[PDB]
Amino acid sequence: LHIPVMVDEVVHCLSPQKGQIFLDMTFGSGGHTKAILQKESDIVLYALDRDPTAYALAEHLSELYPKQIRAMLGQFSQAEALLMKAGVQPGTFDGVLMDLGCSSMQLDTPERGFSLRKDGPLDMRMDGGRYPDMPTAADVVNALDQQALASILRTYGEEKHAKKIASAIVQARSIYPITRTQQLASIVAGAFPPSAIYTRKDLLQRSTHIATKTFQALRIFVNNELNELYTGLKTAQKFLRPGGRLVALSFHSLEDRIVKRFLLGISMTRAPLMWELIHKKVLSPQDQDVQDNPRGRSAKLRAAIKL
C-alpha cells in the first residue's frame, strides 16, 4: 500500500473548509483527494488525471460522495478547456493541489511499463490508450538519433554519460526491437561494466539500478511532464481564487525547478511578484515516514497563495 505523501501537511496547508471549492489536477490513486474529502464533509472538489484508469477510479469513488467530488480526465494543458466547458473560467478555486510524478498504481502494475524491475510492455505512458497514437517509450528509443536520444537522458534523467547510454540503445535497436522494460534495463546496464549495475546509490545512500534515472528521463519525454507542468501551473493561477492556497509536490528537484521559479516569478531559464509562500520550506517527508514510503523520499512541497 502507498500512503499519500505528506497528506498531513497538504491537508493543514490547504485547510479545506466549508464553502470552499478546490481542484485536483492529478487524482491518480485518489489518496490525497480522499484525505481532503474526509476533513471537510461539506467541501466541493474537482479531480483530473491523464490516466483513464485513474479517471475510472474517481468515477467509481464518486459513488462514495455523489457531488462533493467531480471527476475529470485530461492533461494539464487540456484542463482549462475541459473546465472551461463546465463554465468555471474564473474558477475562484480556493486551492489547486498539483501532485506530480507517476502514480503508485501506474508503477505498481507491471503492464503499464513503468517498472524496470518487472517485465511489462515498454509503454511508460501515463495515458491509458485515451490517445492510441501517443508515442510510447519504446517508440522514442527506436526512432531518435544518438544526439537527440542523449538530450532526453542528459536533461530529464540527469544522465552524465549521455553519449554512452544513448549509443548502446542505438546499437541494440538495430539488432532487435526494444519493446520490453527489462530489455531496456539490460541495454542501459550493458553500457557500463557488470559491477556498475547497482553501484549507483539513491539519495539515501541505497543502491539502485544504474538505469533508474534513464527510465525517469523517458517517462518525462513521453508524457511531456515538464512542459505540461508549466501550463498546468499557469492554468491553476488563472482558475485560482485570490487569497487561495496552492500546494504542489515536486517528487524530484527537476520538476521542482519549474514549481520553484513559477511561484517566485523567476525566469525559467521588473514586474512585482504575485505569490505568498506560507510554507516556503521544501523538505522531504519525515525520516520515519521516508523508510515506510521510500518512493516519496524526495517529495518537495511548495505552497503559495495567489496575490
Binding site: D139, F221, L226, T231
Partner: protein, 53 residues
C-alpha cells in the same frame, strides 16, 4: 537632463525546458507513421642506425 524637453507629462515552453520537445515529438510520430589506446614509445628511447651505417 534639466534642459531637455520631456513634453507633456501623463513562444514555446520547450525552450525553457531546454529541449525542443515539439520537434522531437513530431519526429517520433513521423517514425510511428511509417511503423504503422595504443602504446607510444618514449622519444628518448627511439632507436637510430646512423652509427651502424
Amino acid at each position: 537632463l534639466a534642459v531637455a524637453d520631456f513634453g507633456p507629462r501623463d513562444t514555446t515552453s520547450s525552450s525553457l525546458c531546454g529541449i525542443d520537445h515539439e520537434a522531437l515529438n513530431k519526429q517520433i510520430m513521423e517514425y510511428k507513421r511509417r511503423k504503422d589506446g595504443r602504446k607510444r614509445a618514449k622519444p628518448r628511447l627511439e632507436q637510430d642506425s646512423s652509427l651502424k651505417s
